[PDB]
Structure 1
Amino acid sequence: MNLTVNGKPSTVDGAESLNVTELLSALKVAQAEYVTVELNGEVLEREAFDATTVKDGDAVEFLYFMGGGKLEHHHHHH
């Protein structure tokens, strides 16, 4: 189904109806409880991801905000 992601006229091969939650998993966000995204401009609330089902011919805007300038620890152990 066709989805304009952040101005990108792209399409996810097939995909039989996906809600905003499934769009978050499709694009794969790590902070599922802190993710901030909108669709066609309208921003989703912490609990609006599930109920809002998305379909062909829509626009999901996925923000990559925040990050960090120092995360060096590395899970190395012998």
Structure 2
Amino acid sequence: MNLTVNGKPSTVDGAESLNVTELLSALKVAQAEYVTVELNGEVLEREAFDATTVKDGDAVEFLYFMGGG
């Protein structure tokens, strides 16, 4: 399947879809504990990572927020 990750082309052979939890682990996203995930321009809630699914053509973004506020 094809998807966009942080604005760039990405491919996942062997899967037609994946939930966010599997995605984070597979891509072994650093400090996944405190990383923010955006799917198709919407910030996701960590509580729904197991249910939220990424399919061919979706755009995912990994962001990290740090600061005193």
Report the number of matched residues: 69
Alpha carbons 1:2, 1:56 under 8 Å: kept: yes
Contact 1:2 1:10 in 2 (8 A): yes
Secondary structure of 2:31's counterpart equals coil
Root-mean-square deviation (CA, aligned residues, Å) is 3.3
Deviation of 1:16 after TM superposition, in Å, equals: 3.4
Higher deviation after alignment, 28-37 or 11-20: 28-37
TM-score (norm 1): 0.69
| TM-score (norm. length: structure 2) | 0.76
The residue correspondences of 1:1-78 to structure 2 (distance < 5 A) are 1-63=1-63
Offset from partner CA, 1:31-67 (integer Å, 9 cap, x none):
3432211111101112021110111111111225669
Tell me, what secondary structure is at the counterpart of 1:33? Answer: helix
Q: Contact 2:35–2:65 (CA<8 Å) still a contact in 1? A: no
1:49–1:41 Cα change, 3 Å: same
Identity %: 100
Structure with greater contact order relative to length (CA < 8 Å, sep ≥ 6): 2
Max radius of gyration: which structure? 1
CA distance in 1, matches of 2:53, 2:34: 19
Gapped runs of 5+ residues in structure 1? 70-78
Contact 1:38 1:61 in 2 (8 A): yes
Give unpaired runs (5+ residues) of structure 2: none
Which structure shows the bigger proportion of residues in strand conformation? 2
